[PDB]
Amino acid sequence: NAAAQAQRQLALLEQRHGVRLGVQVHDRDSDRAFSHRADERFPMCSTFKLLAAGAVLARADRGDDSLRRLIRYGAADIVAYSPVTGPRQAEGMTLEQLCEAAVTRSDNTAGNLLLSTLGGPPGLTAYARGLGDRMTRLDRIETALNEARPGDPRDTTTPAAMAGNLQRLLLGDALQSASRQRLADWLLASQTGDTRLRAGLPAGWRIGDKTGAGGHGTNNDIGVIWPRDGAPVLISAYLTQSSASREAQNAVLAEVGRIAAHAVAAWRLG
Ligand SMILES: *C(=O)/C=C\NC[C@H](O)CC=O
Ligand SMILES: [Cl-]
User: Distance, CA 91 to ligand 2 centroid (Å)?
Assistant: First the structure.
């Protein structure tokens, strides 16, 4: 069967490359799933920005904050990999702009400003617990959280826990309609990840994804696949302990995408 075939291929892929690979796939159409190390801990890196944006959107839904509120921040607050917030330091950015920069561009300062709005990393963890995720924990801000030391439980999630969060946020009732659509838009618009899961999917399919990258050869890609025919598919892919280049790591994630696409295609064909 297709799920067993996919799990077999993931075992071979992981061994060929000497990595630790964590994958959860859940197809809403057939209700089938497959996984590899899906309950093990993996460093989140930038994938936390999906939850941070969800938490801020949920506050806006309640009137606990406003997406139009302008946030001002200082030159000393700008951390590495901040392509949107860096150039806009003198002018400030609204909460909506920061959500968009964090998700679509993986802007690290934007992620940190969202965290500050939530009260810090503990606010992110508390939000995750409210979604029914008992595993994810954020302990540090960017870029300290990208250390990704093996054996360190700080700043980790599990592939299965993050797939559960994707379902709640994009397909369930965690957010109101307009907020759910905005988050989906930002994920679809991200051109980070063009050589990761996207590279293994058929060209007629679509993917809204949030990437991450960190120390110890950590490279992640999570999101929702919209196949040519049928219902959305949740995918959560975490790779770490790679001794190879980023290009080679991206190719491993592209092969995860091919494996997932073939299983979904078989589920669509019966
Ligand atoms: C998401 O993971 C955003 C950026 N990733 C790369 C790191 O910031 C590089 C330094 O830690
Ligand atoms: Cl939602």
Answer: 31
